[PDB]
Motif scaffolding. Structure first.
Motif, short mmCIF file in Angstrom:
data_model
loop_
_atom_site.label_atom_id
_atom_site.label_comp_id
_atom_site.label_asym_id
_atom_site.label_seq_id
_atom_site.Cartn_x
_atom_site.Cartn_y
_atom_site.Cartn_z
N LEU A 182 63.51 22.60 85.25
CA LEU A 182 64.86 23.28 85.26
C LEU A 182 64.84 24.85 84.80
CD1 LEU A 182 67.33 20.52 83.58
CD2 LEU A 182 67.28 21.15 85.73
N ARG A 183 65.90 25.47 85.25
CA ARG A 183 65.83 26.92 84.61
C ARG A 183 67.28 27.43 83.95
NH1 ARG A 183 67.96 31.76 87.27
NH2 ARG A 183 66.69 33.48 86.95
N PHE A 184 67.11 27.60 82.99
CA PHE A 184 68.35 27.74 82.00
C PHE A 184 68.76 29.33 81.94
CE2 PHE A 184 66.63 23.69 80.63
CZ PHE A 184 67.56 22.81 80.68
N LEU A 225 69.45 24.02 75.91
CA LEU A 225 68.32 23.20 76.48
C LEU A 225 68.65 21.80 76.48
CD1 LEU A 225 65.44 22.98 77.14
CD2 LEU A 225 64.81 22.82 74.97
N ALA A 226 69.26 21.44 77.47
CA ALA A 226 70.15 19.94 77.63
C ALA A 226 69.27 19.09 78.20
CB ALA A 226 71.26 20.11 78.29
N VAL A 227 68.76 18.03 77.39
CA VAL A 227 67.90 16.87 78.01
C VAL A 227 68.83 15.78 78.54
CG1 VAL A 227 66.15 15.39 77.47
CG2 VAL A 227 66.09 17.54 76.41
N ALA A 230 56.24 21.60 74.89
CA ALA A 230 55.10 22.36 75.09
C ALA A 230 55.52 22.77 76.54
CB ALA A 230 53.94 21.38 75.12
N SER A 231 55.95 22.09 77.39
CA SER A 231 56.46 22.60 78.83
C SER A 231 57.32 23.57 78.95
CB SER A 231 56.85 21.17 79.75
OG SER A 231 58.09 21.05 79.01
N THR A 232 58.17 23.70 77.72
CA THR A 232 59.20 24.82 77.66
C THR A 232 58.61 26.29 77.34
OG1 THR A 232 59.70 24.37 75.49
CG2 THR A 232 60.88 23.17 76.94
N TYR A 233 58.98 27.21 77.91
CA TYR A 233 58.48 28.54 77.91
C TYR A 233 59.68 29.66 78.23
CZ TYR A 233 57.47 28.17 82.85
OH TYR A 233 57.67 28.05 84.33
N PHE A 234 59.62 31.05 77.86
CA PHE A 234 60.64 32.06 78.36
C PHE A 234 60.03 32.76 79.33
CE2 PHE A 234 61.63 30.68 73.82
CZ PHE A 234 62.82 30.81 73.72
#
Lengths: 50, 50, 29, 50, 33, 11, 29
Positions: B15-17, B35-37, B46-50
């Motif tokens: 996803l792209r927030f 960050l809606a799961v 760990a898979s999240t980044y900016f």
């Protein structure tokens, strides 16, 4: 016989109405309370709309 | 394995927030996300980044 | 009995009619 | 040919069968749908344009 | 406002009031819906 | 059918 | 009973339909 080089302009006019986009999973009216309005995604969570 | 491992439904891998509230300063920059799961999903941070 | 495919009017499914399944449309009869 | 065949206006003039609801015997066997008041073909000609 | 309905619950569309060929005008006999 | 009431003026 | 408040088509009280008791109309729903 002396018709000029002509180009087609297309448009539509649709008065008196509202552009309905139903919040239904097949865009159909199967009831006033739609199937996505009863879906557990939208009923148990908060979602932004952009 | 073919059972109880991977879903067979519509589900986005990545996803792209978009930021809900940006806030620029002369020395810093603040971005606020949601960050809606969703339902029946797990998210390793760990898979999240900016 | 496929009544979970019907839109619920109230608490009951709005099933159709048995006699509407076919067609008899024909020119002049 | 059909443009330039001059027809006498006295054949169908402003007094033909006064007070009669009468289609002409000349015009019974002529196709009524081959006419510029054929409102379907009038609509279908303008649905592509002028 | 609503088409006619039988109740066998399930909710079944009733065929009454539909148009038919009749030798006599249908308004003086029945209500046509 | 035979249960349809008869046409009268104003009722 | 409340069936003596209905006009008698014949000897039977002309009771209204059970389906006409509620309204369901919305703006396309």
């Amino acid at each position: 016989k002396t018709a000029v080089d002509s180009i087609t302009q297309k448009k539509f006019l649709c008065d008196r109405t509202l552009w309905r986009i139903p919040f239904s999973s097949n865009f159909m009216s199967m009831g006033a309370l739609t199937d996505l309005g009863q879906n557990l995604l939208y009923a148990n969570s908060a979602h932004a709309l952009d | 394995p073919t059972h109880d491992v991977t879903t067979d439904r519509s589900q986005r891998l990545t996803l792209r927030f978009i930021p809900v509230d940006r806030e620029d300063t002369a020395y810093s920059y603040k971005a606020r996300f949601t960050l809606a799961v969703g339902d029946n999903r797990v998210l390793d941070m760990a898979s999240t980044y900016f | 009995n496929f009544a979970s495919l019907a839109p619920r009017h109230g608490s009951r499914p709005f099933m159709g009619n048995w006699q509407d399944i076919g067609t008899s449309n024909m020119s002049g009869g | 040919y059909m443009n330039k065949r001059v027809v006498a206006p006295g054949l169908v003039d402003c007094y033909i069968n006064l007070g009669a609801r009468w289609s002409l015997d000349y015009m019974d066997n002529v196709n009524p749908f081959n006419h510029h008041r054929n409102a379907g073909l009038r609509y279908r000609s303008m649905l592509l344009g002028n | 406002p609503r088409p006619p309905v039988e109740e066998p619950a399930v909710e079944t569309v009733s065929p009454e009031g539909r148009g038919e060929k009749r030798p006599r005008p249908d308004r003086e006999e029945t209500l046509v819906t | 059918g035979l249960r349809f009431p008869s046409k009268m003026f104003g009722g």
